Design a protein around this motif. Structure first.
Motif, PDB file in Angstrom:
ATOM      1  N   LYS A  44       0.799  -1.228   0.000  1.00 43.47           N
ATOM      2  CA  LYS A  44       0.000   0.000   0.000  1.00 43.47           C
ATOM      3  C   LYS A  44       0.832   1.279   0.000  1.00 43.47           C
ATOM      4  CE  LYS A  44      -1.950  -1.350   3.792  1.00 43.47           C
ATOM      5  NZ  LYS A  44      -1.547  -2.798   3.891  1.00 43.47           N
ATOM      6  N   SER A  45       1.811   1.354   0.886  1.00 39.13           N
ATOM      7  CA  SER A  45       2.614   2.571   0.955  1.00 39.13           C
ATOM      8  C   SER A  45       3.538   2.776  -0.238  1.00 39.13           C
ATOM      9  CB  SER A  45       3.365   2.654   2.291  1.00 39.13           C
ATOM     10  OG  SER A  45       2.434   2.489   3.360  1.00 39.13           O
ATOM     11  N   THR A  46       3.962   1.695  -0.882  1.00 41.18           N
ATOM     12  CA  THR A  46       4.835   1.833  -2.054  1.00 41.18           C
ATOM     13  C   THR A  46       4.025   2.499  -3.172  1.00 41.18           C
ATOM     14  OG1 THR A  46       6.038  -0.081  -1.283  1.00 41.18           O
ATOM     15  CG2 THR A  46       6.385   0.575  -3.576  1.00 41.18           C
ATOM     16  N   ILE A  47       2.743   2.148  -3.262  1.00 40.82           N
ATOM     17  CA  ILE A  47       1.871   2.766  -4.256  1.00 40.82           C
ATOM     18  C   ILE A  47       1.759   4.275  -3.960  1.00 40.82           C
ATOM     19  CG2 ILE A  47      -0.513   2.944  -5.109  1.00 40.82           C
ATOM     20  CD1 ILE A  47       0.963   0.601  -6.363  1.00 40.82           C
ATOM     21  N   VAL A  76      14.142   4.344  -2.318  1.00 38.78           N
ATOM     22  CA  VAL A  76      13.096   4.842  -1.436  1.00 38.78           C
ATOM     23  C   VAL A  76      11.885   3.902  -1.533  1.00 38.78           C
ATOM     24  CG1 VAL A  76      11.587   6.781  -0.859  1.00 38.78           C
ATOM     25  CG2 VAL A  76      13.969   7.205  -1.550  1.00 38.78           C
ATOM     26  N   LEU A  77      11.469   3.586  -2.765  1.00 38.45           N
ATOM     27  CA  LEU A  77      10.356   2.671  -3.042  1.00 38.45           C
ATOM     28  C   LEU A  77      10.538   1.306  -2.383  1.00 38.45           C
ATOM     29  CD1 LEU A  77       9.969   3.564  -6.803  1.00 38.45           C
ATOM     30  CD2 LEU A  77       8.148   3.691  -5.052  1.00 38.45           C
ATOM     31  N   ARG A  78      11.780   0.852  -2.289  1.00 45.38           N
ATOM     32  CA  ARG A  78      12.088  -0.441  -1.682  1.00 45.38           C
ATOM     33  C   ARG A  78      12.125  -0.485  -0.145  1.00 45.38           C
ATOM     34  NH1 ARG A  78      12.923  -5.160  -5.092  1.00 45.38           N
ATOM     35  NH2 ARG A  78      13.210  -4.289  -7.200  1.00 45.38           N
ATOM     36  N   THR A  79      12.178   0.682   0.506  1.00 45.64           N
ATOM     37  CA  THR A  79      12.241   0.738   1.979  1.00 45.64           C
ATOM     38  C   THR A  79      11.005   0.181   2.664  1.00 45.64           C
ATOM     39  OG1 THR A  79      11.348   3.003   2.084  1.00 45.64           O
ATOM     40  CG2 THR A  79      13.759   2.761   1.990  1.00 45.64           C
ATOM     41  N   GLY A 100      -2.253   1.101   8.043  1.00 46.78           N
ATOM     42  CA  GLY A 100      -1.411  -0.071   8.208  1.00 46.78           C
ATOM     43  C   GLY A 100      -2.230  -1.337   8.185  1.00 46.78           C
ATOM     44  N   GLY A 101      -1.592  -2.441   7.784  1.00 44.00           N
ATOM     45  CA  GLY A 101      -2.266  -3.720   7.685  1.00 44.00           C
ATOM     46  C   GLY A 101      -2.083  -4.701   8.818  1.00 44.00           C
ATOM     47  N   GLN A 102      -1.216  -4.383   9.780  1.00 41.24           N
ATOM     48  CA  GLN A 102      -0.987  -5.268  10.924  1.00 41.24           C
ATOM     49  C   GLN A 102      -2.225  -5.258  11.804  1.00 41.24           C
ATOM     50  OE1 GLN A 102       1.683  -3.553  14.227  1.00 41.24           O
ATOM     51  NE2 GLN A 102       2.301  -2.260  12.510  1.00 41.24           N
ATOM     52  N   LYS A 139       3.589  -9.055  -8.317  1.00 43.68           N
ATOM     53  CA  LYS A 139       3.499 -10.025  -9.394  1.00 43.68           C
ATOM     54  C   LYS A 139       4.897 -10.471  -9.817  1.00 43.68           C
ATOM     55  CE  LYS A 139       3.426  -6.988 -13.388  1.00 43.68           C
ATOM     56  NZ  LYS A 139       2.529  -6.259 -14.316  1.00 43.68           N
ATOM     57  N   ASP A 140       5.901  -9.605  -9.644  1.00 47.71           N
ATOM     58  CA  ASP A 140       7.296  -9.934  -9.971  1.00 47.71           C
ATOM     59  C   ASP A 140       7.875 -11.018  -9.038  1.00 47.71           C
ATOM     60  OD1 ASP A 140       7.123  -7.779  -7.937  1.00 47.71           O
ATOM     61  OD2 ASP A 140       9.286  -7.541  -8.109  1.00 47.71           O
ATOM     62  N   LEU A 141       7.459 -11.009  -7.780  1.00 49.52           N
ATOM     63  CA  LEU A 141       7.939 -12.011  -6.830  1.00 49.52           C
ATOM     64  C   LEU A 141       7.110 -13.284  -6.985  1.00 49.52           C
ATOM     65  CD1 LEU A 141       8.304  -9.953  -3.508  1.00 49.52           C
ATOM     66  CD2 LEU A 141       9.934 -10.146  -5.424  1.00 49.52           C
TER      67      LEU A 141
HETATM   68  N1  GSP Z   1       9.699  -6.753  -5.186  1.00 49.03           N
HETATM   69  C1  GSP Z   1       8.613  -6.090  -4.818  1.00 49.03           C
HETATM   70  N2  GSP Z   1       8.622  -5.518  -3.595  1.00 49.03           N
HETATM   71  C2  GSP Z   1       7.454  -4.856  -3.344  1.00 49.03           C
HETATM   72  C3  GSP Z   1       6.352  -4.749  -4.168  1.00 49.03           C
HETATM   73  N3  GSP Z   1       5.325  -4.030  -3.541  1.00 49.03           N
HETATM   74  C4  GSP Z   1       5.871  -3.694  -2.409  1.00 49.03           C
HETATM   75  N4  GSP Z   1       7.163  -4.133  -2.214  1.00 49.03           N
HETATM   76  C5  GSP Z   1       8.120  -4.003  -1.077  1.00 49.03           C
HETATM   77  O1  GSP Z   1       7.437  -4.650   0.010  1.00 49.03           O
HETATM   78  C6  GSP Z   1       7.757  -4.083   1.328  1.00 49.03           C
HETATM   79  C7  GSP Z   1       6.468  -3.750   2.029  1.00 49.03           C
HETATM   80  O2  GSP Z   1       5.825  -2.700   1.230  1.00 49.03           O
HETATM   81  P1  GSP Z   1       4.809  -1.599   1.908  1.00 49.03           P
HETATM   82  O3  GSP Z   1       4.399  -0.633   0.845  1.00 49.03           O
HETATM   83  O4  GSP Z   1       5.474  -1.162   3.168  1.00 49.03           O
HETATM   84  O5  GSP Z   1       3.609  -2.503   2.326  1.00 49.03           O
HETATM   85  P2  GSP Z   1       2.330  -1.993   3.162  1.00 49.03           P
HETATM   86  O6  GSP Z   1       1.126  -2.734   2.761  1.00 49.03           O
HETATM   87  O7  GSP Z   1       2.365  -0.543   2.862  1.00 49.03           O
HETATM   88  O8  GSP Z   1       2.571  -2.634   4.700  1.00 49.03           O
HETATM   89  P3  GSP Z   1       1.877  -2.025   6.059  1.00 49.03           P
HETATM   90  O9  GSP Z   1       2.131  -0.589   5.885  1.00 49.03           O
HETATM   91  O10 GSP Z   1       0.474  -2.509   6.207  1.00 49.03           O
HETATM   92  S1  GSP Z   1       2.716  -3.077   7.360  1.00 49.03           S
HETATM   93  C8  GSP Z   1       8.544  -2.756   0.991  1.00 49.03           C
HETATM   94  O11 GSP Z   1       9.952  -3.046   1.160  1.00 49.03           O
HETATM   95  C9  GSP Z   1       8.283  -2.536  -0.570  1.00 49.03           C
HETATM   96  O12 GSP Z   1       9.413  -1.937  -1.235  1.00 49.03           O
HETATM   97  C10 GSP Z   1       6.317  -5.376  -5.451  1.00 49.03           C
HETATM   98  O13 GSP Z   1       5.327  -5.351  -6.182  1.00 49.03           O
HETATM   99  N5  GSP Z   1       7.526  -6.009  -5.684  1.00 49.03           N
END
Ligand code: GSP
Ligand code: MG
Length: 313
Positions: free
Chosen positions: A15-18, A143-146, A171-173, A240-242
């Protein structure tokens, strides 16, 4: 003209990466000052990742490939503290580097479904030389990967296609989901994220419940919530990449015992899409707009979001 998008989904669904992507796509991205702010998070994510593998090696009884790694591992804890303060000495980098190349470490890394490990572990660890260089400044992808668990409500604004977007991320926890109801007012559309790669994992909160099954319960709840009848439900089957990488070496039958298709991305993906869309109890009256995404890939998100916006109108 204002549009309220509410991002929902289980822990680490993306969610936060979006949200960060909206900054990169609709603004001009993270500035040098903002990127530098992330430098401490990149380094803690990196140490956190290598310590997680080293911890796992103890529980699972995996030896180091070379005995010499033992003191490198001890030197790791002696120097780790520096990392979260935003500092990375050549000595620490050297220690992580050597640890990451060890066969025993690599053997444990490949068993990462047996424990909790940052999705971006290999991404950071494989780029050790770059991130450890003097005066390192995180790139937008860094930054996107954090990874930082979200607590509270983060609100973000941007203009796209003449619309004033007001995006809400929560948050999703466990503890945080209880607070989602505070954001249920005036939602124009919900973007519910799902980590496709979760199918063979147990929760960070529990290990007898499949993470995807939990994602399904949450989606069943939201999607069918009559409060959300006139709200567009967008589903992002994320990571989808993983998933593509995992499906080749991990059976989807773990999550869905009834799966008869093959271990191919296209077949397995469509199957999961159907699993979630099938939860919709009002198929003829309510439409779920599904999209397969890789949140960290700007281009994918850019085209997917453009599509979602047209749906929102
Ligand atoms: N390889 C890959 N990593 C991804 C992808 N989407 C998110 N991530 C990685 O996953 C980890 C968690 O992403 P995040 O955006 O924090 O999840 P969240 O749903 O926001 O998590 P929360 O806030 O409820 S605990 C981060 O390190 C982010 O870079 C994806 O599509 N591919
Ligand atoms: Mg988050």
């Amino acid at each position: 003209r204002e549009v309220k998008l509410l991002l929902l989904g289980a822990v680490e669904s993306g969610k936060s990466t979006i949200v960060k992507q909206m900054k990169i796509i609709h603004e001009a991205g993270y500035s040098e000052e903002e990127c530098k702010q992330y430098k401490a998070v990149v380094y803690s994510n990196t140490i956190q990742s290598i310590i997680a593998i080293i911890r796992a090696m103890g529980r699972l009884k995996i030896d180091f490939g070379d005995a010499a790694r033992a003191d490198d591992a001890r030197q790791l804890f002696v120097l780790a503290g520096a990392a979260e303060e935003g500092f990375m000495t050549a000595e620490l980098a050297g220690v992580i580097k050597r640890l990451w190349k060890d066969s025993g470490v690599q053997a444990c890394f490949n068993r990462s479904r047996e424990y909790q490990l940052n999705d971006s572990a290999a991404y950071y660890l494989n780029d050790l030389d770059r991130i450890a260089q003097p005066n390192y400044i995180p790139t937008q992808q860094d930054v996107l990967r954090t990874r930082v668990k979200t607590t509270g409500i983060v609100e973000t604004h941007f203009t796209f296609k003449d619309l004033h977007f007001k995006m809400f991320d929560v948050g999703g926890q466990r503890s945080e989901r209880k607070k989602w109801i505070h954001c249920f007012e005036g939602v124009t559309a919900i973007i519910f994220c799902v980590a496709l790669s979760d199918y063979d994992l147990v929760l960070a909160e529990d290990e007898e419940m499949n993470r995807m099954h939990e994602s399904m319960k949450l989606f069943d709840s939201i999607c069918n919530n009559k409060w959300f009848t006139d709200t567009s439900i967008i589903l992002f089957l994320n990571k989808k990449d993983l998933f593509e990488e995992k499906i080749k070496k991990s059976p989807l039958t773990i999550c869905y015992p009834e799966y008869a298709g093959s271990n191919t991305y296209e077949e397995a993906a469509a199957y999961i899409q159907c699993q979630f869309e099938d939860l919709n109890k009002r198929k003829d009256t309510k439409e779920i707009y599904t999209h397969f995404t890789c949140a960290t890939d700007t281009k994918n998100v850019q085209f997917v979001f453009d599509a979602v916006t047209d749906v929102i109108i």
